[PDB]
Amino acid sequence: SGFRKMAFPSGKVEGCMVQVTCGTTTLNGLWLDDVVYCPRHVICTSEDMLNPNYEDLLIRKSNHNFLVQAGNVQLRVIGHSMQNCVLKLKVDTANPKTPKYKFVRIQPGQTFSVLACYNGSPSGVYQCAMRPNFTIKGSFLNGSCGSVGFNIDYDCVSFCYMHHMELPTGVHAGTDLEGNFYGPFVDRQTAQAAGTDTTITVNVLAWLYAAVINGDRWFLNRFTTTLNDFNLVAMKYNYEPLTQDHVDILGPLSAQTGIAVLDMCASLKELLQNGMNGRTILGSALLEDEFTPFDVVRQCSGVTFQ
Amino acid sequence: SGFRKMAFPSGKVEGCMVQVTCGTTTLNGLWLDDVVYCPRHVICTSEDMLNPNYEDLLIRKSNHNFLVQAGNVQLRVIGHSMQNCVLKLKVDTANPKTPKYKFVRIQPGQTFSVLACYNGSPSGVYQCAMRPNFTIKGSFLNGSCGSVGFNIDYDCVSFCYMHHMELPTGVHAGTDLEGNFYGPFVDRQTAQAAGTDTTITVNVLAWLYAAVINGDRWFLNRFTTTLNDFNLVAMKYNYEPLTQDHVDILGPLSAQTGIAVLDMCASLKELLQNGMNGRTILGSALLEDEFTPFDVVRQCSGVTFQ
Ligand SMILES: [Cl-]
Numbered sequence: 086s087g088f089r090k091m092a093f094p095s096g097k098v099e100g101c102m103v104q105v106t107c108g109t110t111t112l113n114g115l116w117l118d119d120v121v122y123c124p125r126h127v128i129c130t131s132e133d134m135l136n137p138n139y140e141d142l143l144i145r146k147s148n149h150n151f152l153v154q155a156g157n158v159q160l161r162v163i164g165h166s167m168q169n170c171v172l173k174l175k176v177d178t179a180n181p182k183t184p185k186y187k188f189v190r191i192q193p194g195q196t197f198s199v200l201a202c203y204n205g206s207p208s209g210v211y212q213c214a215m216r217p218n219f220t221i222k223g224s225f226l227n228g229s230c231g232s233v234g235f236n237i238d239y240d241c242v243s244f245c246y247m248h249h250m251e252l253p254t255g256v257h258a259g260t261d262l263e264g265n266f267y268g269p270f271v272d273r274q275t276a277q278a279a280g281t282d283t284t285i286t287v288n289v290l291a292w293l294y295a296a297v298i299n300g301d302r303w304f305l306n307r308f309t310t311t312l313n314d315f316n317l318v319a320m321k322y323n324y325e326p327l328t329q330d331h332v333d334i335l336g337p338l339s340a341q342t343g344i345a346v347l348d349m350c351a352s353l354k355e356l357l358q359n360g361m362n363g364r365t366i367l368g369s370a371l372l373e374d375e376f377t378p379f380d381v382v383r384q385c386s387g388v389t390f391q
Numbered sequence: 392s393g394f395r396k397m398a399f400p401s402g403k404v405e406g407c408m409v410q411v412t413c414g415t416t417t418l419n420g421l422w423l424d425d426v427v428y429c430p431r432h433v434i435c436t437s438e439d440m441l442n443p444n445y446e447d448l449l450i451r452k453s454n455h456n457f458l459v460q461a462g463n464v465q466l467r468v469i470g471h472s473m474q475n476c477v478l479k480l481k482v483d484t485a486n487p488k489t490p491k492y493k494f495v496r497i498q499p500g501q502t503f504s505v506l507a508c509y510n511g512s513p514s515g516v517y518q519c520a521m522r523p524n525f526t527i528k529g530s531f532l533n534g535s536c537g538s539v540g541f542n543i544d545y546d547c548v549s550f551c552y553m554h555h556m557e558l559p560t561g562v563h564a565g566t567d568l569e570g571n572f573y574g575p576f577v578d579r580q581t582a583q584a585a586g587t588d589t590t591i592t593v594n595v596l597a598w599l600y601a602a603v604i605n606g607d608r609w610f611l612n613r614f615t616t617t618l619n620d621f622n623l624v625a626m627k628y629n630y631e632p633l634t635q636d637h638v639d640i641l642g643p644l645s646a647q648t649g650i651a652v653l654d655m656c657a658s659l660k661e662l663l664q665n666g667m668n669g670r671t672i673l674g675s676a677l678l679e680d681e682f683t684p685f686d687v688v689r690q691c692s693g694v695t696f697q
Contacts, residue, residue, distance in 0.1 A: 086561045089530035091515035094506065096402030156697075200400065206695035209397035210516060222674070224395035226693045255392045255606065300561065360669075368528070370676035387532045389512035391462075 088295050088367050090375065091384055092198040092212040093237045100182035103160070104205030105174070105231065106152040113202045113231030114153065114174070115244070115262070117183050121153055121160070121174040122262055123231045124249045125167055126272050134274040143167055154205060155180075169264030170272050171247065186242040188262040193217045194285040194325070196377050197234040197245050201225060214288070214375040215246075216256075217325060218280035219268025223248070223257040234259075240391045252277055285374040286324045287331040290349055291381045292373045294338040296366045298385055304366060305344070310351040322357045334378045394601050394673050396681065397690055398504040398518040399543045406488035409466070410511030411480070411537065412458040419508045419537030420459065420480070421550070421568070423489050427459055427466070427480040428568055429537045430555045431473055432578050440580040449473055460511060461486075475570030476578050477553065492548040494568040499523045500591040500631070502683050503540040503551050507531060520594070520681040521552075522562075523631060524586035525574025529554070529563040540565075546697045558583055591680040592630045593637040596655055597687045598679045600644040602672045604691055610672060611650070616657040628663045640684045 105114040105123045109130065114123035126134060128142050146165070151174055153160040164175030191197065193215045201208045201224060213221050213234075225232065225248055234246030249272055250258045256279060258270040270277055297305070316326045332346045339346050353372075361370060376384075411420040411429045415436065420429035432440060434448050452471070457480055459466040470481030497503065499521045507514045507530060519527050519540075531538065531554055540552030555578055556564045562585060564576040576583055603611070622632045638652045645652050659678075667676060682690075 086532075086557065087528060087530040087563070089515075089517040089519070090396060091507070091517045091530060092398060094402075094405050094513040094516055095400045096405040096513075099400050099402040201397070203693045203695045206697060207400040207402075208693060208695050209395075209690070210400055211395040211397045213395070222393060224393040224397060224690060226392075226691075228693065251392065257393070363666075365677070368677075371671070371674075384515070384530060385532075387509045387514060387534065389509045389514050391512060 086299055088299055088384065090212050091380075092210045093235065094390065095198065095200045095207065095210045097184040097237070097242050098200050098233065098235055099207050101180060101184070102200070102202050102205050102207060102233075104154040106154070107146065107150055111204060112228060113205055113233075115231065115233050115247070116153075116155060116160075116176070116180045117186060119176050119179045121162075121176055122171050122247065123174070124247065124260075124272065125170050125172045125264070126230070126249065127172065136275075137273060139167065170249065170260050170266060171262065171264030184242045185240055186244060189236075189243045189245050190261045190263070190265070191215055191245040193219060194288060194377070195245075196288075196375055196380055197236050199223060199232060199234045199246070199248070201229055202232045203228045212375065214285060215267065217283045217285065219266075219270075220252070220256040220258055220279050220282070221246075225251060225257055233262075237390045252279065254279065281323065284322070284324045284372070286319055286327050286353075287334065288374040288377055289324075289353060289372050290331075290335060290346070291338065291378040292367065292376045293349055293353065294335070294342055294344070294378075295376065295381045295385065297342050297344065299367065301366050303364065304352050304356055306352050306355055308351040308355065309348050310354055312347065312350075315347070315350045315354055318354050318357060324357070337382060338378060392605055394605055394690065396518050397686075398516045399541065400696065401504065401506045401513065401516045403490040403543070403548050404506050404539065404541055405513050407486060407490070408506070408508050408511050408513060408539075410460040412460070413452065413456055417510060418534060419511055419539075421537065421539050421553070422459075422461060422466075422482070422486045423492060425482050425485045427468075427482055428477050428553065429480070430553065430566075430578065431476050431478045431570070432536070432555065433478065442581075443579060445473065476555065476566050476572060477568065477570030490548045491546055492550060495542075495549045495551050496567045496569070496571070497521055497551040499525060500594060500683070501551075502681055502686055503542050505529060505538060505540045505552070505554070507535055508538045509534045518681065520591060521573065523589045523591065525572075525576075526558070526562040526564055526585050526588070527552075531557060531563055539568075543696045558585065560585065587629065590628070590630045590678070592625055592633050592659075593640065594680040594683055595630075595659060595678050596637075596641060596652070597644065597684040598673065598682045599655055599659065600641070600648055600650070600684075601682065601687045601691065603648050603650065605673065607672050609670065610658050610662055612658050612661055614657040614661065615654050616660055618653065618656075621653070621656045621660055624660050624663060630663070643688060644684060
């Protein structure tokens with residue numbers, strides 16, 4: 086028993102992390118097969134970032150201007166291309182530690198682990214969610230750009246995020262591994278508006294099920310409610326609306342606990358209107374939305390990876 | 392910026408995890424050089440655990456009764472010994488992925504990462520603290536015994552914990568890698584009393600410094616206080632007393648933020664007596680004690696490992 090904000094084991098990703106230097110700027114790259122992926126703004130100086138013309142800056146660069154280091158193994162760049170907001174550096178060596186992997190574009194509310202890196206070396210791993218406004222609330226310092234987010238399914242690494250920017254508000258923005266930003270953000274040092282950040286309701290419900298599984302049931306009540314009545318309340322507190330697809334995803338947790346999804350919703354409704362009264366759930370004094378229904382099932386069933 | 396409950400990268404530990412089977416029971420072992428370390432209760436049946444006589448049970452076992460699997464590599468046991476509550480299994484193969492490592496016995500209030508494993512395969516990684524009563528509040532299911540806790544300093548893995556038991560209260564107990572339990576616990580399925588769990592004050596202060604570094608300063612006040620007056624209040628709320636050694640450890644954070652340790656203590660005193668008023672600090676509605684002063688400095692400075 087017990088419940089923890091658990092990240093994926095990072096070992097398969099650690100062996101893919103490299104340092105990328107272009108002139109004076111150094112960040113992290115991801116070395117898969119014979120290609121290194123990194124944020125295109127590795128080619129910018131601090132001044133360039135205010136209003137970069139990436140095609141013109143990249144035109145001034147040649148394969149030999151990029152220095153790629155993996156530990157004390159310098160890789161040779163023999164081709165380079167810009168794909169959206171990522172640079173693809175073709176190197177002469179295939180990464181011997183390349184895992185089975187895929188690139189995936191996740192949806193808001195999905196969770197993943199981040200391996201925070203500096204100078205191509207791993208610092209720490211943590212789990213986070215893609216917020217509904219396509220930001221992440223990370224922990225990143227200067228030099229962490231190119232750090233990656235991932236999931237694992239059995240033996241395959243799904244890369245879903247590359248870190249690019251800290252917004253002036255302290256939240257973080259990045260791209261998929263095809264270089265398309267999540268959200269309306271651009272890789273420019275300019276004021277940028279993130280939308281309203283709503284709470285991921287389907288995830289809150291999942292965590293309430295986790296709480297029940299683990300012996301925390303004080304919040305269970307014998308009211309019930311309808312999906313429309315619940316969404317009416319959710320929206321007042323900036324909670325995402327629940328759809329039938331969400332009810333479908335929660336089914337297995339409903340079955341395991343004997344608590345129907347709409348009954349759990351009525352419990353949530355009461356917590357929203359009346360608060361937690363200085364009580365806690367799974368050691369938390371706030372409702373938690375960084376566990377998906379799949380995360381809960383995974384943690385409560387002991388799934389492993391190879 | 393940002394602050395996250397960050398675990399160490401787990402890759403160096405992943406390659407040390409093996410499955411250990413003795414008759415019908417299977418758990419995790421730690422393979423370093425040519426020795427496998429695992430909980431001695433791998434030799435017990437479910438019935439044996441109520442009142443095991445470990446010497447007599449072990450006397451019935453021979454090297455060939457233990458099955459050690461690392462992926463699809465079966466290791467041969469050629470010698471075995473019991474050291475306190477761990478079994479040392481001498482195997483015929485040195486682990487090629489043995490990191491630089493040491494065994495350390497940590498003190499209450501220190502933090503470490505746990506790599507939760509099942510059947511010798513990693514499931515997830517999370518960071519936790521040794522509580523003052525020598526328990527941990529983990530996430531462990533059946534079969535996770537032998538999962539290990541560790542820290543990394545540059546290139547060296549310090550193993551500090553092996554998981555052995557879930558107490559009837561849902562909290563977790565285990566040993567150092569010499570097999571000595573943390574706390575007064577025994578590897579027997581019997582009711583066991585953990586002490587009062589106090590809050591780790593030096594860690595709370597560290598996290599308050601982290602909050603300031605990250606822009607959360609609403610809780611700063613212009614009261615001050617003395618160490619004795621503060622400890623008088625701490626004890627009323629089941630907080631560990633602060634000593635001069637703790638004040639010494641916080642010095643660098645004091646210097647970086649310009650806030651003296653005793654001033655930070657007066658801020659804490661006010662939060663204890665008046666609560667947080669439905670406000671948050673670093674996204675939390677409770678005071679957090681699972682970051683040490685070293686963790687804060689490490690996360691706020693970007694330390695990496697090799
Ligand atoms: Cl909280």
